[PDB]
């Protein structure tokens, strides 16, 4: 019944796709006060892992 999250051929893209799940979003556990710069630097500032396509 439930959706299968891919983790087979890779783990980083599977981890970010897991992060894309609702109620498990990019916000860390509804952060009350602090300890947010390190995780945003680690993950949301490191969003780029693949390429893109365009004609130039």
């Amino acid at each position: 019944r439930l959706n299968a999250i891919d983790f087979k051929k890779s783990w980083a893209k599977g981890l970010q796709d897991l992060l894309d799940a609702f109620e498990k979003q990019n916000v860390p556990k509804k952060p009350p006060d602090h300890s947010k710069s390190n995780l945003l630097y680690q993950q949301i500032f490191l969003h780029d892992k693949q390429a893109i396509e365009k004609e130039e």
Partner: protein, 465 residues
């Protein structure tokens, strides 16, 4: 009117059988394939060198970050990225007195100053490795500012090179001792002050990148493989030939060709070439006499047999200049009939700057250009979307590959080169301009052609960079 065919970035294999493009980010994610249990660091220098090395390693214990880490990624700490431990304790030190330094320095001749310093360092390493009951796997000597700035050949106030680390490594080849050279300015930019005040080796915003480079070099020299290559067809050997010129005074130095061999593993099973007085530099086109050609080919073949227990079905040969036909005639007389010979020449001096018609970033790395079926232009330099910045300055310049003889698919050699150019070990970078077998070619030629006393060097790679 003509297209620029792109080649995908080959992913390097990491821990748990997984792959990622960037070595820094994925290495922070997964880690090394085979962990070591830790190594002992032997620092050779002064008390100032002791305290600055201990302070720097304690600094790199804790996680440190660069200015923006899309380009220069994070350093989470040595234990947090490699697994093997590193602490200021159990570190062996060898005393380098100022009295020997001053007595050597007061001599006017700079060349014999280099001679006596390398003799002192080699003798102290020998007397540290031949009688000490402890064990050191990696050595980290420290050179201060005054020694580096006074040992320059042209600083104005014969069988050895003027520079230090080349002949230190060359004389340390025979005893199979791995070591690393660290400038004082490299790890002590905090107190290294010029006339203005700024650090000369301004590593402030990239102390994470410095820690990345140093830690990767240390883990390479430790014995654990940092990364391997993703896709390799069975039965191919990347024989990147060196033709570093040798200038040992007035004797016939001629050609001192060497090679690095890639068969199934990232490390290069390097076999030394001959001192080799043949092919007078009037004919300095850097060809090969047939007998040394079959010697080198047989060396590579039996290396493949001893490391893979089979015959290589294909041979890659890399060089900078072109190839003749008699050397390939001598080559093919010893090859098995099912083999294939490919000789690819790599050049850089060809001027070709593909300017960007409009935008804010130049041509990326990996966009190749095909001229013929045997020669092509490959862009191993420039922008990459993962790092989100270029690796070059102004406009990058591509490499020009050329299959001299032997039939092959140009896409196959293009992908092989693009896979080869992402294994830089001494510098922890995503990619470089030249391929790794050619980037390390200058280093291995300089080391193997600095001391003539070496006959059969250690063919592992850890004693060179």
């Amino acid at each position: 009117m003509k297209e620029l065919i792109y080649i995908e970035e080959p992913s390097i294999l990491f821990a748990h059988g997984q792959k990622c493009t960037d070595p820094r980010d994925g290495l922070a994610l997964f880690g090394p394939l085979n962990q070591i249990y830790g190594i002992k660091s032997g620092v050779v220098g002064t008390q100032k060198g002791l305290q600055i090395f201990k302070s720097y390693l304690d600094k790199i214990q804790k996680p440190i970050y660069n200015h923006n880490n899309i380009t220069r990624p994070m350093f989470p700490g040595f234990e947090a990225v490699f697994g093997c431990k590193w602490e200021s304790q159990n570190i062996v030190f060898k005393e380098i007195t100022d009295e020997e330094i001053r007595r050597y320095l007061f001599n006017a001749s700079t060349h014999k100053r280099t001679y006596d310093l390398v003799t002192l360092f080699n003798d102290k390493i020998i007397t540290a490795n031949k009688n000490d009951e402890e064990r050191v796997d990696v050595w980290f000597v420290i050179v201060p500012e005054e020694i580096y700035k006074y040992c320059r050949p042209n600083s104005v106030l014969y069988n050895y090179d003027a520079q230090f680390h080349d002949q230190l490594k060359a004389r340390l080849l025979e005893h199979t001792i791995p070591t690393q050279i660290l400038r004082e300015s490299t790890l002590a930019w905090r107190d290294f002050k010029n006339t203005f005040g700024a650090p000369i080796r301004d590593f402030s915003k990239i102390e994470g990148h410095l820690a990345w480079t140093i830690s990767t070099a240390a883990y390479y020299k430790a014995g654990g493989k940092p990364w391997k290559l993703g896709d390799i067809r069975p039965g191919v050997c990347y024989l990147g030939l060196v033709y570093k010129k040798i200038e040992k005074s007035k004797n016939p130095q001629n050609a001192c060709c060497a090679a690095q061999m890639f068969l199934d593993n990232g490390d290069g099973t390097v076999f030394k070439g001959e001192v080799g007085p043949w092919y007078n530099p009037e004919k300095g086109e850097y060809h090969l006499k047939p007998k040394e050609a079959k010697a080198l080919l047989t060396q590579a073949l039996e290396s493949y047999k001893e490391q893979n227990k089979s015959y290589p079905k294909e041979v890659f040969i890399h060089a900078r200049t072109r190839f003749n036909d008699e050397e390939w005639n001598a080559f093919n007389e010893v090859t098995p009939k099912n083999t294939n010979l490919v000789g690819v020449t790599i050049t850089k001096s060809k001027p070709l700057k593909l300017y960007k018609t409009e935008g804010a970033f130049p041509i990326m790395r990996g966009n190749a250009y095909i001229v013929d079926e045997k020669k092509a232009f490959l862009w191993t330099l420039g922008f990459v979307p993962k790092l989100q910045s270029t690796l070059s300055m102004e406009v990058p310049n591509p490499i020009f590959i050329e299959i001299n003889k032997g039939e092959a698919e140009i896409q196959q050699v293009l992908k092989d080169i693009l896979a080869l150019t992402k294994l830089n070990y001494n510098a922890c970078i995503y990619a470089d301009g030249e391929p790794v077998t050619l980037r390390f070619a200058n280093k291995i030629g300089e080391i193997l052609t600095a001391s003539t006393e070496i006959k059969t060097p250690p063919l592992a790679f850890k004693y060179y960079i």
